[PDB]
C-alpha cells in the first residue's frame, strides 16, 4: 500500500548515510580499518607486525 | 590498539630489554616497574568491563 | 662522550620535518571533512524544510 | 596513490641521506688527520702492523 515508496526510500537513505559515516571515518581517521569486525585478518597481521 | 593492551605489552618488553644492557642502573629498574603498574590497570580494566 | 650523549639527546631534522608535514596535511584535510560532516544533518533538514 | 599516514618515498630518501653523511664524515676525518687509519675500525690488521 501507501508506505511502500517511503519504506524503500528510507532503506536506501539509511544504507547510503551509514556508508558515508563509515567513509568519513575512513578519511578522518587516516586508516582503512578500525575494528576486527571489518577485516579481522588484517587486524591480526597488524598486531603481529607491531 | 590504543584501547588495547598490545601497545603496553610490547613497550613492557622493550623496556625489559633495556634493563638487559644497564643492569646496574636504578632508573631503568624504576621505569620497568612503571610499565608493569601501567599494565596492571589495563588488564583489570578489560576484565572489569567484561 | 659527546658523541654518545648526542645519539641519545638530539633530534634529526629530517624526521621531524616530515612528521610536521604529515600532521599539517592531516589537520587541513580533517577540518575540511569535519565541515562537510556538520553540513550533513543540515541536509537532512533540507528534507525537512 | 594518495597514501595515508605514510609518505613511503620520503622514508626511502632518508636512508640515502644517511649513507652520504657517513661517507662524508669518514672523508673529512681522514683528510684532517692525515692518516688513512684513524682507528682500528678503518684497517685492523694494517693498524697493528
From Swiss-Prot, chain B:
Coiled coil: none annotated. It is found in: Secreted; Bacterial flagellum. Belongs to the flagella basal body rod proteins family. This is Flagellar hook-associated protein 1. The lineage of its organism: Bacteria, Pseudomonadati, Pseudomonadota, Gammaproteobacteria, Enterobacterales. The gene is flgK. The chain holds residues 102 to 151 of 553 of the full protein.
Amino acid at each position: 500500500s501507501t508506505q511502500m515508496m517511503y519504506e524503500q526510500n528510507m532503506s536506501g537513505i539509511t544504507n547510503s548515510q551509514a556508508e558515508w559515516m563509515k567513509l568519513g571515518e575512513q578519511m578522518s581517521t587516516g586508516k582503512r580499518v578500525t575494528n576486527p569486525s571489518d577485516d579481522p585478518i588484517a587486524a591480526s597481521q597488524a598486531v603481529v607486525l607491531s | 590498539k590504543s584501547s588495547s593492551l598490545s601497545g603496553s605489552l610490547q613497550s613492557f618488553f622493550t623496556s625489559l630489554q633495556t634493563l638487559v644492557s644497564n643492569a646496574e642502573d636504578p632508573a631503568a629498574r624504576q621505569a620497568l616497574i612503571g610499565k608493569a603498574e601501567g599494565l596492571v590497570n589495563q588488564f583489570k580494566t578489560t576484565d572489569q568491563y567484561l | 662522550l659527546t658523541s654518545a650523549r648526542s645519539r641519545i639527546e638530539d633530534s634529526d631534522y629530517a624526521t621531524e620535518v616530515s612528521n610536521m608535514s604529515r600532521a599539517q596535511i592531516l589537520q587541513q584535510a580533517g577540518t575540511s571533512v569535519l565541515a562537510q560532516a556538520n553540513q550533513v544533518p543540515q541536509n537532512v533538514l533540507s528534507l525537512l524544510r | 596513490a594518495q597514501v595515508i599516514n605514510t609518505n613511503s618515498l620520503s622514508l626511502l630518501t632518508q636512508n640515502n641521506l644517511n649513507k652520504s653523511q657517513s661517507a662524508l664524515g669518514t672523508a673529512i676525518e681522514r683528510l684532517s688527520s692525515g692518516l688513512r687509519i684513524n682507528s682500528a675500525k678503518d684497517d685492523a690488521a694494517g693498524q697493528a702492523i
